[PDB]
Every structure is written in C-alpha cells, then in structure tokens.
Amino acid sequence: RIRIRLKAFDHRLIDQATAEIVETAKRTGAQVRGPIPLPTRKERFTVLISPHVNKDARDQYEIRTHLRLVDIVEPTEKTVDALMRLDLAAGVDVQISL
Amino acid sequence: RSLKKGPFIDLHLLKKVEKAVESGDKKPLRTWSRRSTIFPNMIGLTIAVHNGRQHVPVFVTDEMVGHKLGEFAPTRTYR
C-alpha cells in the first residue's frame, strides 16, 4: 500500500538509511518487503580540462543516483505517522505515496 | 518557404507606407527593415533600404512582391 521510494548519491549512506527507515517501521509495522535495488541512474558528463586549444584533453565525471523501494503492504497506525516527522539521516530524497 | 500564415512587416513601415500611399508620391522613405516582405500596394514607391552603411533606393515593381526588401540590397561588396 505505502510506496516508499528513496534515492540518494552515496550507497554506503543510503543503505543504512533504508535499514533504519525499515526497522523503525517493521519492529512495530511489520510485513515489509525490504530494500528493493531499483537500479542506479548514471548521469555522465565530459568537459574540457583546458580553457583553450588542446581539445583532445577532456575530463569525464559522473553522478550516481541509487534508488530503493521499501513497499510497505498494510497502512497501519504504527506505520503512517511513524514514517512522518522522522526525516533525519539527510542526503536522501524520500517519497511516500499512499 | 516559411511563415505560411501571412507576410511579415513592421508597424512603422506599414504605417509610413499607408500614409505615403494615401498622400501621393513622396521622397524616398528611409527604411531599415529588410526582414519585411513587399505588399502589392507599395508598387511605385522609391523606398531606400539600409544595406549596412547607406540606403539604396529601389523602385518597387509588380514582380518584386513575394520577395523581401533585403533581396535588393547587396551588402557585401567584392572587388
């Protein structure tokens, strides 16, 4: 029922964010589905490292956006509000849909 | 080739053209709008189109209708 989709940049932060947001909702709101992988979006960019000639020299950067679905099944009272006003462990865009 | 709906003209150009037409023959009208087309009602005017540094007067003709004014203002002088 409750579609929780969370995306961030650093995996070794988003993973534990998901762990805490899942155990703070399964210890009292159990029957959850867990951290679905939701493959990463890789936004790449290729710029020139020089302000002038020597175009052949370029730098290649990228930003990874890791996504995860929790997918809670039942809209429980131990869940609906226990999801709210608990927005710590920042750096992660979380979206809850009914 | 473009602008399927209606020719294009400037407000100043159209107003001055209608004024001079309802007035009669007048001195060459200094224009700067080469982007504008040519109406059938402007035949006879000696308007002077800007070429970049001067104004070349052109005598509007019945054939010089579908084209624009810039088609008759050679800008780049070669030799």
């Binding site: 710029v47 930003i63 | 400037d10």
Partner: protein
C-alpha cells in the same frame, strides 16, 4: 566579464518573464486554424510587434552564473565547464567524482 553584458542579460530575463509567459496567447492561441483566419490574426501579428525586440526567450543566451561565459555551458549545473570542473574537484558538487569504466 563585461558587467555590461551581464546586466543586459539580467534585464533581458526580467523583461522576458515579465511580458512573455503571461501574454503568449497573442501568438499561441490567436494564430490558430479556426474562425480567426480573418483580420483578427492579422491584427494579432500586428500587435506582436507591441513588445520590444527583447522579451523573447530565444535572446536568452544562458551564460554562466559565476563568470558569465556564453560557451561551454551546462544546463544541469548552470555553470561553465571551467567552473564546474573547479567546483567538482574542490568537492562542491555532490556525487560528482571522476568517472571511470
């Protein structure tokens, strides 16, 4: 970097968002294939010169926000390539590290 050009560009942005995006119906709705095929659309295109040569979105060059550079611009970060590299290597842009694959 030609503060004159930068002030010119911010003036363009202000005047454009002020006039267009609010009165665009004069060229988007009236110039339609409908009963407006008569002098209505002619007067519509006539008044389309009411607004100055500016005010259009195509005259927006989208220069950089730190320097004001016209070339090498990225719509994602709003900066030129030089400054985006500098900031990425200093650690200002999140998630943006050197790509290798």
């Amino acid at each position: 970097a030609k503060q004159s050009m930068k002030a010119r560009e911010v003036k363009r942005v202000a005047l454009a968002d002020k006039y267009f995006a609010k009165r665009a119906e004069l060229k988007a709705i009236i110039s339609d294939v409908n009963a407006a095929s008569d002098e209505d659309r002619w007067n519509a295109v006539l008044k389309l010169q009411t607004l100055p040569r500016d005010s259009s979105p195509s005259r927006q060059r989208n220069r950089c926000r730190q320097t004001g550079r016209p070339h090498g611009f990225l719509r994602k970060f709003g900066l030129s390539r030089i400054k985006v590299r500098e900031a990425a290597m200093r650690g200002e842009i999140p998630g943006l590290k050197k790509a290798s694959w």
